[PDB]
Design a protein around this ligand. Structure first.
Ligand SMILES: CCCCCCCCCCCCCCCCCC(=O)OC[C@H](COP(=O)(O)OCCN)OC(=O)CCCCCCCCCCCCCCCCC
Ligand SMILES: CCCCCCCCCCCCCCCCCC(=O)OC[C@H](COP(=O)(O)OCCN)OC(=O)CCCCCCCCCCCCCCCCC
Ligand SMILES: CCCCCCCCCCCCCCCCCC(=O)OC[C@H](COP(=O)(O)OCCN)OC(=O)CCCCCCCCCCCCCCCCC
Lengths: 124, 481, 52, 83, 89, 71, 85
């Protein structure tokens, strides 16, 4: 009943109980059940989408709402990446020149050819 | 001989009353005979070898020694020998997997099962379009009867599906075969790559052949009959339908389509890739929301068949070798999974709903170990033939079209998801409250499962061991200028 | 567990465990002293390689 | 500690706290088979062992590169980046 | 060791099936010989690299280039393309 | 002295180590081969290579200084 | 390992209650004493005591079973009913 996908099935039942679904993980685990691990009692009706609400379904997190958690996750990524990118601007310059190598950058040692020295060849 | 052997059959039936020991003996002899044929098969030759003709006008009841060929032709090359070996390995196991659970009218049941096996075996020997089509259709009434009389609660709808869908596709194949017949006045597979039809007529003939392929493989979107038929079939029916009958479609692609309609096939390949990618992705995702064990196992076969299709239509040697290896490995592993769900669990509990099963490891550790092994084999763990087939099929698909094969690489994940989701619940947790403890797997059930696992492991460790029958085949059908 | 809501006795710990703790801690502190003495310049940051 | 368990449940791994009464004799058999297997494997795989470097001579390497250059000159083959 | 005589599609009449079969097998066998040549080049390249180490870039340049050149052309290609098409026309 | 190209190849120096100072690298690696790369060994050869690298890095910092001064 | 006995549970609970300052008297604590009546413990005080009991024997009392224990003997039989404590 509660979610959009359980509602969408409402035309698809005729004479099947319209069960309001509750995630089995959120049932209090100190009550007693015929199957304690699944937190189910015998002959208990199943929602049409029961496979998405039983104990083997993906875990549900209660502390935050899903929307707010999305806000926090996007915000963390945004602030981290934006801060790093901005920091790239305010950077000191190095003090030593990048090193160099004999034979025009050892272009022969890294394969290379007379006719093709830009492809293979170091800073020389 | 035939007279004497018929007398033997008659007396055995008179005294024992159960035909099944005789059928097991006949099928074991057939397997030995095929192995002897393999011993005398020349591998340094791409020509058909053990040829014979039936129903020639000069000798309607014998073999044809005439200068005019108007009967039905039979013979084998390496490609057909591969599938024949798979068939004769599987048939006795399909007899043995129903040894104890068929009690009323069992002689008819075993007769139907053995007949279906023999028809498929002959189908792989057929050397012309008409003989192929005849043996292709002849399984349908036998399957209809077998499923209707010995299937589970919904087996009437299932028998009607297995007849009607396959007839539907086969009749369009029949249109194509009639057109080939009247346009070329020849129908045989020995020289049919020598006939080059105009591109337009090629394009038309291809459509009928491919509609039949689409229903028999099956491919999206005409697959929905296979879960029903597999779910309601008795065990031997499911084993034959998943291990052998679906391979007939891959064989049909190689034997009936590629040599004759090469240019049209080039033109049509992107459409095939669309269909196969849809098959893989959509059927893999649809498996996630199934609640019947046998239905889940059945849905798995469709995605693996999609991967095989992508390989066999890749116009590469690696892709065709991968498609054939995948077909063989699936023929090993899928009958084992059907044995577990519809032979072992179903014979103990007579129910297939997933909610009832949980934590089988406590009382049946051996069955749980078999489940784990067969699951990781089914999702293509390396050193299994399934991995070799899938990997080579994906290589060929990626070469044929990098984007489409690259996206096809998600099947690794998707198959892992549905299969391991099932096995996680089957083995883990506390023993279910709804079922009482039963025996762990028996000696017969373990024997069947062991045969299948050893076969898939042997071709998984050394897939090259099939190459001596197939190295001509991986070049016979690619079209490169 | 004779005493409840009361002061606890000094724990009893094996002689071997006490000795092993002594050896481990002594070796760790000594090794660190050795390394600090031997690598003081480079590890603290000295003798700048830039020309003066 | 421990608890009851069904005695009919036969697992290749032994099941619950599997400690057979004759385990020392069975262990002697198992270790003998282990030693035999390891020594057979170590000896049989010896001919397939080789070192990585100094197995082909400079003559072979140099002449193979020369022949490949010959092959690339028979065909018209420029080098990578050579344009 | 067998050495069947080589037959070409361009010479034969497509109605002698023995000649057509021989031409198909000849085409496939020649492709497998080409694959053997590529494998020889690749094996020599692996040996050169493993004995050269840091100077493989120099000592195996010819082998590397030749392997990369022969990779696209020395694979299996089938016979159907050539038997069903006549290059002259 | 800068090593010969033939010498550099013969001692199989890694490319990034082929500099004006690889001449010292050769003995250092020979000693690091004789001793089993142990930290207490090869002190003289190790230090000589380090000093050569000191000189190279100093020349590069003066190069960067000149380049900075142009701007 | 470690195993508790009914008398160990009782001795721990009695020392626990003896430590509580809101109690009427220490000498009057019986096995079948009522905390509400004999010890005169408030509504919230018996809650504090149940919380102390669960913090002492390392278990978790549900709301419905916490409010059910009214006597010390009830507490002891509850704590002995629980396997891991
Ligand atoms: C109702 C469905 C539609 C029915 C239409 C088709 C009905 C066919 C009836 C089945 C009969 C076919 C099998 C028997 C024919 C083979 C007999 C034979 O001798 O094969 C000839 C072939 C060459 O022999 P030859 O030239 O004489 O030289 C021998 C040198 N020593 O020798 C060989 O190379 C050996 C060939 C082995 C072929 C393997 C056959 C496997 C299956 C055999 C039984 C199948 C029964 C199927 C029953 C269900 C109906 C389909
Ligand atoms: C729907 C269901 C439809 C069912 C379809 C089944 C049709 C089966 C037709 C059977 C004809 C095919 C028989 C395969 C031929 C195998 C054979 O050769 O049998 C031996 C003999 C002829 O042998 P021969 O010609 O001499 O060649 C061998 C030389 N080495 O052969 C004979 O002597 C004839 C013996 C066969 C008699 C068949 C009678 C019909 C069945 C009653
Ligand atoms: C390469 C191929 C290697 C093939 C390995 C051959 C395995 C043969 C022996 C397997 C025996 C494992 C077994 O029986 O475990 C059963 C286990 C319960 O056993 P247990 O711990 O004794 O008792 C618990 C409750 N009774 O029940 C379980 O928990 C199931 C775990 C089974 C572990 C199987 C180990 C193999 C996994 C690799 C499979 C790869 C598939 C490809």
């Amino acid at each position: 009943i509660r979610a959009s996908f359980d509602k969408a099935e409402e035309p698809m039942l005729g004479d099947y109980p319209d069960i309001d679904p509750f995630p089995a993980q959120l049932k209090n685990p100190y009550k007693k059940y015929d199957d304690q691990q699944d937190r189910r009692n015998l002959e208990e009706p199943l929602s049409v989408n029961d496979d998405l609400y039983d104990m083997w379904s993906p875990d549900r997190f209660t502390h935050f709402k899903n929307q707010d958690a999305l806000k926090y996750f996007i915000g963390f990524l945004t602030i981290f990446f934006g801060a790093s990118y901005v920091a790239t601007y305010f950077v000191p310059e190095k003090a030593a020149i990048p090193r160099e190598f004999p034979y025009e950058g050892l272009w022969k040692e890294s394969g290379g050819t007379e006719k093709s020295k830009a492809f293979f060849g170091q800073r020389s | 001989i035939l007279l004497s052997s018929l007398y033997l059959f008659n007396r055995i039936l008179a005294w024992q009353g159960n035909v099944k020991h005789f059928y097991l003996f006949a099928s074991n002899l057939l397997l030995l005979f095929i192995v002897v044929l393999y011993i005398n098969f020349n591998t340094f030759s791409n020509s058909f070898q053990f040829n014979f003709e039936l129903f020639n006008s000069l000798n309607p009841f014998g073999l044809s020694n005439s200068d005019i060929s108007n009967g039905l032709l039979f013979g084998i090359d390496g490609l057909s020998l591969t599938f024949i070996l798979l068939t004769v390995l599987l048939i006795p196991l399909t007899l043995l997997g129903n040894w104890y659970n068929i009690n009323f009218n069992s002689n008819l049941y075993y007769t139907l099962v053995l007949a279906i096996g023999l028809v498929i075996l002959l189908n792989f020997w057929a050397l012309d379009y008409i003989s192929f089509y005849i043996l292709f259709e002849a399984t349908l009434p036998l399957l209809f009867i077998l499923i209707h009389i010995y299937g589970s609660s919904d087996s009437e709808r299932a028998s009607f599906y297995v007849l009607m869908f396959t007839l539907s596709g086969s009749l369009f194949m029949l249109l194509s075969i009639v057109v080939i017949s009247i346009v070329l006045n020849t129908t045989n597979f020995i020289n049919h790559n020598l006939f080059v039809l105009s591109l337009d007529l090629q394009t038309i003939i291809w459509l009928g052949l491919f509609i039949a392929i689409m229903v028999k493989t099956p491919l999206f979107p005409i697959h929905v009959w296979l879960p029903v038929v597999h779910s309601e079939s008795p065990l031997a029916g499911s084993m034959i339908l998943a291990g052998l009958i679906l391979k007939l479609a891959l064989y049909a692609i190689l034997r009936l389509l590629l040599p004759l309609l090469c240019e049209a096939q080039i033109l049509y390949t992107p459409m095939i890739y669309i269909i196969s990618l849809l098959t893989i992705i959509l059927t893999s995702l649809a498996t996630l929301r199934q609640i019947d064990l046998k239905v889940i196992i059945a849905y798995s076969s469709i995605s693996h068949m999609g991967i095989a299709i992508l390989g066999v239509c890749s116009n590469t040697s690696l892709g065709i070798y991968g498609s054939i290896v995948l077909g063989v490995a699936h023929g090993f592993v899928s009958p084992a999974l059907f044995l577990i769900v519809g032979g072992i669990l179903y014979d103990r509990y007579h129910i297939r709903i997933v909610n009832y099963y949980k934590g089988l490891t406590t009382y049946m550790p051996q069955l749980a170990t078999y489940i784990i092994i067969l699951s990781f084999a089914n999702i293509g763990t390396p050193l299994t033939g399934n991995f070799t087939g899938e990997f080579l099929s994906l290589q060929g698909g990626f070469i044929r079209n990098p984007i489409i094969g690259g996206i096809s690489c998600i099947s690794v994940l998707l198959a892992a998801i549905y299969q391991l989701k099932l096995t996680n619940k089957l083995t883990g947790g506390i023993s279910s409250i709804y079922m009482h403890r039963t025996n762990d797997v028996t000696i017969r059930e373990k024997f069947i499962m062991n045969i299948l696992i050893i076969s898939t492991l042997i071709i998984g460790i050394c897939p090259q061991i099939m190459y001596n029958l197939l190295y001509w085949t991986v070049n016979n059908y690619i079209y490169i200028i | 567990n004779y005493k409840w809501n009361g002061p606890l006795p000094r724990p009893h710990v094996s002689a071997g465990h006490r000795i092993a703790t002594k050896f481990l801690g002594a070796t760790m502190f000594f090794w660190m002293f050795l390394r600090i003495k031997e690598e003081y310049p480079a590890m603290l940051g000295l003798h700048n390689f830039y020309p003066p | 500690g421990r608890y009851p368990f069904p005695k009919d449940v036969i697992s290749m791994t032994g099941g619950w706290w599997a400690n057979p009464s004759n385990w020392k004799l069975n262990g002697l058999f198992a270790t003998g088979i282990a030693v035999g297997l390891a020594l057979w494997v170590s000896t049989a795989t010896l001919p397939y062992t080789r070192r990585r470097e100094g197995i082909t001579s400079e003559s072979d390497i140099s002449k193979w590169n020369a022949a490949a250059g010959v092959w690339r000159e028979r065909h018209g083959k420029i080098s990578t980046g050579e344009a | 060791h067998q050495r069947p005589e080589l037959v070409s599609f361009d010479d034969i009449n497509y109605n002698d099936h023995k000649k057509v079969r021989e031409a198909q097998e000849s085409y496939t066998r020649e492709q497998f010989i080409r694959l053997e040549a590529l494998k020889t080049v690749r094996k020599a390249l692996e040996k050169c690299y493993e004995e050269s180490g840091p100077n493989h870039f120099e000592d195996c340049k010819n082998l590397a280039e030749q392997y990369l050149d022969m990779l696209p052309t020395h694979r299996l290609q089938g016979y159907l393309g050539y038997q069903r098409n006549d290059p002259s026309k | 002295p800068l090593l010969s190209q033939e010498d550099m190849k013969k001692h199989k120096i890694l490319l990034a180590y082929r500099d004006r100072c690889a001449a010292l690298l050769v003995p250092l690696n020979e000693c690091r081969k004789k001793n089993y790369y142990m930290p207490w060994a090869c002190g003289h050869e190790r230090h000589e290579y380090e000093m050569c690298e000191v000189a190279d890095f100093q020349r590069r910092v003066k190069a960067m200084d000149k380049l900075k001064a142009e701007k | 390992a470690h195993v508790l006995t009914k008398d160990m549970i009782q001795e721990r609970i009695v020392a626990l209650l003896e430590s509580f300052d809101k109690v009427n008297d220490a000498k009057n604590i019986t096995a079948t004493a009522n905390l509400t009546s004999d010890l005169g413990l408030d509504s919230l005080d018996v809650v504090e005591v149940v919380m102390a009991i669960e913090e002492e024997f390392g278990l978790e009392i549900p709301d419905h079973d916490a409010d059910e224990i009214k006597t010390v003997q009830q507490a002891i039989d509850y704590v002995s009913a629980q396997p891991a404590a």
